[PDB]
RNA sequence: CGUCAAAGCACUUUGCAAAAGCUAACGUAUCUGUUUCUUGCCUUUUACCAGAAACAGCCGUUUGUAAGGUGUGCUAAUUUGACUGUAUAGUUUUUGUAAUCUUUU
């Protein structure tokens, strides 16, 4: 990250672990190979809320553009 | 080659499915991109240098199956499978040593 990280989560049904910051960035870190695979590229800025759902394989972020 | 069974047949157009099952060229061919890292040349970012791992696209290949098209036959031809497939009256099996009678329990 370039800016505090914000948010972290680990999901227990896959091996990933998540996080977010004040870049708008939103990380999936595989924890097999301990590298980044995705980005959850679409808010305009500073992420702060970081969860995920139980069930469904679905995630959930919010900050400051107003808006989860 | 011979029998039996199945089926139109050869050639072709699309659709739809699949293609490491026990280490192996679906392709004796081979190109671009994204992300994450490492080094190059550098300060405008792009555009690039040349290594890695992780993903992707693209140009192609094979198979099965479904419907079609052309040419030929449906009073035929071709394909496909299956099979415990040969002929011997003259000594080891399919052209007879068989026939017949009687006694014992």
Redesign the pocket.
């Known amino acids: 990250h370039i800016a505090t990280v914000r948010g972290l989560a680990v999901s227990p049904r896959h091996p990933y672990l998540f996080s977010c910051g004040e870049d708008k960035m939103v990380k999936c870190w595989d924890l097999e190979?301990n590298?980044?695979?995705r980005?959850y590229h679409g808010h305009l800025s500073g992420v702060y809320a970081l969860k995920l759902h139980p069930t469904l394989d679905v995630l959930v972020t919010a900050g400051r553009d107003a808006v989860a």
């Open positions: 190979t590298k980044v695979i980005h």
